[PDB]
């Protein structure tokens, strides 16, 4: 996070390069976020 | 915010206004995403006494429309459906754009 | 005198008093050919006579507009013309006659 | 008696006159329809279809019903002449992708429960 | 102007219904029976026209209930049986009508529960 | 002749002697709310849901049991009748279990429907609820007696129609319970009908349990072929 | 009675009743009934032949001046001998009022087109023709407006099936979109929701 | 076609580029909404009004709710009415932004669209916070509103509202005094007052011709008689005057929003009548009456006394009306929907006489047509 | 109360005439519009870096449906069929029977996600918080059939998203 950016750019995730079985170096998608970090990332809550 | 002061001056001169006063991006002045729990008061029908539903039943006070002049059954001044509307007033705030 | 009536396609009327007098006189003349017992004739005569007296009694346009409650005397002229056309039409229609037909027994029964 | 109000025709003779006029119009239109829509049918097929559609409602004995049928036919014709219809709409009259449903008792008994 | 049409009403050619659903359909005109699980009678006041049940099968996927009958959900409400019959006749449907069944008037007597010599006496209360 | 004139909401109607207030109201097309009255059973008068006001009478009468008197004026929609219905509905719901989602009677409940049509919309009951143990009366009638409103319809049906005296009430007061008092099976060729007359989910069909809701069922009126009665 | 119940307005009720009496007195030839609803809405039930006179009066009389046509539509009631109920909703800006005019027709009896009175009626009348099949006499250009080209039937009729009779799909053999008899993988599930107990005593009907 | 504003088949007879005849063909978005509504309960038919005019969703919800409330003879609570007026003004801002920016985009100026759609995104965020849906909220119900505002929504609405006037000023800097924009808009599609009245126009299409008529002022609903705002009135009856009217309406909506924010009262959000409005979940899980009423409301729905009503509101596109007919059951017998776009499109051919192709594109843009409400 | 938007008269003095002539000949307002666009060019854009950054959402958000359990691992659904009765799109199909232990449970629970309008009426109607609309919205498929959810899929969704679903419900159940 960085709270000096405007709302929307103040939280982000650098995805892993190796998910369950597939190589996610280039192929990433928002579905790879687990539900708890999904709640934090979409600003449904302030607490990680 | 992050813009250098020279860029802000150029923006202000080009737009003609002070942009930094009213920025269209929300930085930190908005409400927190986590809030305390609410309490949400109850309505006027939450009494424990003198609250019989028959006295506050609005659905049961509807009646079939009142019939005037069934065909199957003095000067008499002419009438209108309603009084004529008053003329509108011209906006003492700002009458002309 | 006045410019910009304010409604698009409604021209400013010069000499509105004479136009209103002519229109109301024509309306009364047309109503004179309707049977006396007809409600439309007496109602329209009453309202037309009130408006004609108001027009005759008030030489000022703005005060006349405030008295007539008719909205900006040009629209009063337009309404007078509409009433004249309606008077001719109802003379051709004769709606004062008894009811032409009675509806079936339950035509207006609701619910079902 | 029966206290009915006409639409255009007072008796059946005028209704048949209007029907003949509409049939003339459709018969004249068919070749232009085949050309403009680039239909793969012949003009004889189109005129046969027009005749069949007309014969579908031959049993009517009410002049008002005939009048409404003529109004609908004129609507369809004006719709075809102005190319508001597409080739799919014109070709819908022929049911080229519908399998022939049998009408005899035995085949109906074989296929299913519907009469 | 009146023209004095002498024929019976028939609007089948104008309704746009396919002929298969005009000739082979049988409608029922009836006052629906009271649901035996409840005592209210508000659902036994109007006449109903409903169509004959057709085939329903299982969808190969998801096992749902599939139909090919467009009139399977059509129910019409009428004030009287004459109106329903007239509607069905002018629409060209064969119909079966059932006369309205009303409960017969019953003689009730609370005192009969305590008869001196009759069998209506109750053994419990 | 022997007919007497009575009034329902000021509307005149001619009735036979011995006709009850409920039947006179039924003559003009008005249905009085009920829980214990069944027109094919004996009159009980215990549920008290049928109380209506008679004009110039300070006491409401039980319409299911009280015969009409000549010249009476039944006021079925007066404030007194509505308040009586609301009070009775409140008392009936005081100890009822919050079982509607799991009750088979869900969309077919006379208690639910009469609560929506004639009762109040809120509860002012702040105590614990009573709960009774279930009875086993066979494999056909499922028994959940906490839903019982003690209308005694099943007892009257068994005693009078089925010809069996196996059902009754044990105890008294708030603790009065409908049952057999012993492990007994209520088997008769007419037993299942007690499911129909029971206005609540206290008696339900065991083979039918949980399978369907009433609003999604399609009704087909047909004939029975399991015997020659038709 | 105070918080949850909609308040009444007796002044508007009296004004609408007086104006309904006025209209009924002026046009006895066509007016059959006048009603004022409990929420202060005025309705006039007329004979079909008076569609053009009545409306004209209501648009041109100095005391009516109903110069706006808010809406024109139809209602299908199969139990009536005259199936269709034609409703005109009119607005008067001069007197800030609204009026409803109702009449009736059946499948074979045409209604007079009122495009000469209100130009707004045009499309509305077309819509009534398309959804209900009510013919309007002397309509400048009467044809379907809402339904597909070549569509048979009138969908808003009560006896018309909800899903219709035909469905569309692309066919690769004829290489075009074709229409076929309708088949549903899941049939629409009809719900019987009406409670067997009466809800509104004020609308109870006589027991016939 | 990008300028078709959705599914419209405008068959045009042209002499060169001069328009000789316009024939709008509609029904490409006719989904048969009214029959389907006839197959639903009153609560089940509410989300259809979201999808009627998919730019003024909550205004359509409000119109339907007013009709059903009138038929039920009940009254929404004051806080619900203030919430309704506030979100109706926010919806008016959304609709006017969409209309003006798509009109400019059709004319050729594509830039203000991107500037104003960020504000549209923020208002979508308000919608989602109040309801859980950015467009189809189903929030305004025939008893009030579904849920109360979250505990920090008013502050964010205030923060958004105090910066919107500068965005309007930037839009006006782009368009108002531009000679190209004036050339493309002035004297184009001129309609007279009497023609506008006879053709059934409403909203800006009247006010641009000088007719002084606003339903919020003449026939107020909810708490619209307790707010102060001016009505913009045109002088020439052309596209430029209507554009100015819509900009000034956005400013007046900001005014009304400020008044609503400062005047929000406390209290309950739906009518305290459990036979119409569902009880709270805690009551439904503790009280027997509440559970019975919740069950019956969500299975059968409330019954509405028999009768017919025509309820109209001042939606951002004009007068929006419902003719609702109840037969006494829990399902509406008839629901006719009156949309202003129907009459506006029916008058399009009249307004395009003596104009070119680009002028017709401008006239379609200035009519503010959404075809969900036109076709239904 | 009304105001005029286009009822102003230009000044006819020589200075005003010359100013208007300068505006006509030297294109002042066009340069004003150019200045507005130039000012926007130097601002920070409003774009976010999807999928690494996400748009803000709310605990009330309506996404993919899920069937929940009690803390014991028993299902919450009792097959009352209220959600099926309230569903405006008829998207829910339910079949039920007594379980082997006599429990009232579903044997079929389908939601057609191509019929669903995502209105959330089902979770309002549910008396045991059994069916919910979760926070997930990234569940696009490559085939139509993958959007026809059965009970196994919904139970799987509940087990997968329960950690976020419970937290979302905890932050909003006092508004319900
Ligand atoms: C071009 C970019 C900047 C934007 C604008 C835009 C799209 C994509 C598609 C369309 C579009 O605008 C045109 C004109 O305005 C509406 C308005 C509509 O309803 C408000 C509507 O509904 C289908 C459709 C349209 C057009 C069309 O589909 O992205
Ligand atoms: S008996 Fe009736 S009120 Fe009681 S739980 Fe069953 S359905 Fe609900
Ligand atoms: S079990 Fe049912 S029928 Fe028997 S007394 Fe109880 S409520 Fe009445
Ligand atoms: S969200 Fe709405 S449409 Fe979707 S399943 Fe639930 S009730 Fe049905
Ligand atoms: S999900 Fe909820 S509402 Fe639906 S059947 Fe199960 S318990 Fe009932
Ligand atoms: S019905 Fe009369 S006391 Fe029960
Ligand atoms: Mg039972």
What does this structure look like?
- This is part of a larger assembly, with nine protein chains of nine kinds.
- With 112 residues, chain C is an all-alpha fold.
- Chain D has one domain.
- Chain D is flat.
- Chain E has 125 residues and is an alpha+beta fold.
- In chain E, the strands form two sheets. In chain E, strands 5-2-1-6 form a four-stranded mixed beta sheet, covered by helices on one side. A two-stranded antiparallel sheet of chain E has the order 3-4.
- Chain E is flat, with a radius of gyration of 23 Å.
- Helices cover 15% and strands 19% of the residues of chain E.
- Chain E has three helices and six strands, in the order ααβββββαβ.
- The longest helix of chain E is centred in the last third of the chain and has 11 residues.
- In chain E, β3 and β4 form a beta hairpin.
- Chain E has a single domain, classed as atu1810 like domain (Double Stranded RNA Binding Domain).
- The chains are: A little secondary structure (48), B little secondary structure (97), C mainly alpha (112), D mainly alpha (115), E alpha+beta (125), F alpha+beta (230), G alpha/beta (208), H mainly alpha (376), I alpha+beta (176).
- At the D-G interface, α3 and α4 of D face β9 of G.
- β5 of chain H pairs parallel with β1 of chain I.
- The structure holds ligand 970, iron/sulfur cluster (4 copies), FE2/S2 (inorganic) cluster (FES) and magnesium ion.
- The site of one iron/sulfur cluster has 15 residues of chain I, from α4.
- Chain G: Core subunit of respiratory chain NADH dehydrogenase (Complex I) which is composed of 45 different subunits. Interacts with NDUFAF3. Interacts with RAB5IF. Found in subcomplexes containing subunits NDUFS2, MT-ND1 and NDUFA13.
- Chain G: Keywords: NAD, Translocase, Transport, Ubiquinone.
- Chain G: It catalyses: a ubiquinone + NADH + 5 H(+)(in) = a ubiquinol + NAD(+) + 4 H(+)(out).
Provide a brief overview of the structure:
This is part of a larger assembly, with 9 protein chains of 9 kinds. With 48 residues, chain A is largely without helices or strands.
Fold topology:
The structure is cut from a larger assembly and holds nine protein chains of nine kinds.
Chain A: H1 35-41
Chain D: H1 12-37, H2 43-56, H3 63-81, H4 87-91, H5 105-111
Chain I: E1 2-4, H1 14-26, H2 28-41, E2 65-67, H3 82-86, E3 92-98, E4 104-112, H4 121-125, E5 131-133, E6 148-149, H5 151-170
Antiparallel strand pairs in I: 2-5, 3-4, 4-6
Bound molecules: ligand 970, iron/sulfur cluster (4 copies), FE2/S2 (inorganic) cluster and magnesium ion.
Region (Disordered) (chain E): 100-125
Family (chain E): Belongs to the complex I NDUFS4 subunit family.
GO biological process, one term (chain E): electron transport chain
